[PDB]
Amino acid sequence: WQRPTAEYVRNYEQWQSQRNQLQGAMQHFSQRFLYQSSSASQGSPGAYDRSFRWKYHQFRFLCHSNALPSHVKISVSRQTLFEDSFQQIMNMKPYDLRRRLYIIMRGEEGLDYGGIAREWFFLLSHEVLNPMYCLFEYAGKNNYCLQINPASSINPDHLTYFRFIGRFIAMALYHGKFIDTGFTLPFYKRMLNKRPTLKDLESIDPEFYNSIVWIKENNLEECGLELYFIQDMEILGKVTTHELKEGGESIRVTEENKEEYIMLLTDWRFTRGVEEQTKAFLDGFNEVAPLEWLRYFDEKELELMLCGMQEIDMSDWQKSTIYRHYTKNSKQIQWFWQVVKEMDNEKRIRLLQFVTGTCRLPVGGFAELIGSNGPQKFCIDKVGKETWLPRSHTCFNRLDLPPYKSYEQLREKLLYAIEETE
Ligand code: NA
């Protein structure tokens, strides 16, 4: 479907190298885990404690409880995996996708149908990113910041493909299997009916972020203004202007209209060009696994449910950290790593998601970390004043850590910053 352009061919290759990296990465992928099934009354979650564990068990309980009996057989060939999965899953009634899932890899026997189901989920979760289908693009170099392609309607079946992707992701959650497609935290936020934020723009589009901030920083008029409640987009040529409001072309932007402007424009940047595609994703998801079942999860917990946890090697982490104005030996940095040393693995993941915008770690670990601009190690900067919380720049894998005056000040601030939502 994709027109044979300069970007398309660049993207084609980059995705092919993913395929050459695919085999090795699945051994790494096999070490992802969550929690052993609840051993209670029909896997009852127990009494509510705010933990991720409880939410996991609670959500599994609903899956178990609502699952149709018997089983369903998805029959696919290793080399036509996308097309075969798509045909099978989209000709089933969505309720039948909640029955126990048997993946039959054509001509491959061997048992450990769990093994096989896990591999299929992993491989299918990369296969959907094939540039050929026009569904996705990245915002940075490499595979940085996956987003729906606004020119996806190049593929005339693109909405039905988004529906299948929705079903497949729900089936991952529904059967406790991990995927690796690489959706962003704001994309999870949309699955939770949560409104993405100005801070979130920094993750997906730092340039666009830096300006929206320099609108709200700057007083207006002083240094010009000259804006309407409109924004342009360029979907496959057609420089389509888009009203921020109804009759927006006339609706002219003042200083009085500026916080409204920012809210509408924040909202615009996340939704622009990808509305029908996201709707089709959500409808596919929702017919297999009700989105209402996600109600306890924040976007980071949702990510972790889908991707699975991995153990964080402290040594690798600490080894591949770089500093700005701090050294390794600085007082605040000593306290930082002490707090990290005392965290359990799940809070270590929480901090990783806070600083980098994902729970996922590249195959080499911390030395291989990508920011927007390409390689970018985990970085701690001496920035802020004491009464500030720590802040991150996910674009740069960067934590701004105020020069706090004690371990307990730092500890409480950092724990607070990482546990916050919206
Ligand atoms: Na096969």
Author numbering: 358 to 395, 482 to 865
Pull text from the paper:
However, we were able to solve and refine structures for the apo-proteins which were improvements on previously published data. The available crystal structures for WWP1 (PDB ID: 6J1X20) and WWP2 (PDB ID: 5TJ819) have missing domains and/or high Rfree values. The WWP2-LH crystal structure was solved at a resolution of 2.05 Å in the same space group as that reported in the literature. Unfortunately, however, the WW2 domain was still disordered and therefore missing from the structure. The grid boxes to perform the docking simulations were generated in cavities on the HECT domain surrounding the active site cysteines 890 (WWP1) and 838 (WWP2) given the ability of NSC-217913 to interfere with ubiquitination. The ligand poses of compound 11 in both WWP1-2L34H and WWP2-LH are somewhat similar due to the similarities of the proposed binding site between these two enzymes. These poses show the imidazo[4,5-b]pyrazine moiety engaging in π-π interactions with the phenolic side chain of Tyr639WWP1-2L34H and Tyr587WWP2-LH alongside the Cys640WWP1-2L34H and Cys588WWP2-LH backbone amides participating in hydrogen bonding interactions with the imidazole nitrogen. Against WWP2-LH, the butyrate chain has multiple hydrophobic contacts with the aromatic ring of Tyr587 and the alkyl side chain of Ile813, with the backbone amide from Ile813 also undergoing hydrogen bonding with the carbonyl oxygen of the ester. Lastly, the side chain of Ser646, located at the rear of the cavity, forms a halogen bond with one of the heterocyclic chlorides. Interestingly, all compounds modelled against WWP2-LH also participate in halogen bonding between Ser646 and the same heterocyclic chloride.
The HECT E3 ubiquitin ligases 1 (WWP1) and 2 (WWP2) are responsible for the ubiquitin-mediated degradation of key tumour suppressor proteins and are dysregulated in various cancers and diseases. Two members of the NEDD4 family, WW domain-containing E3 ligase 1 (WWP1) and 2 (WWP2), are of particular interest due to their targeting of the tumour suppressor protein phosphatase and tensin homolog (PTEN) as well as various other tumour suppressors and transcription factors. The HECT-E3 ligases may offer the best druggability as they participate directly in the Ub transfer, unlike the RING-type, and with their catalytic function relying on a single active-site cysteine. We evaluate their structure-activity relationship (SAR) by synthesis aided by molecular docking using X-ray crystal structures of WWP1 and WWP2 solved as part of this study and improved over those previously reported.
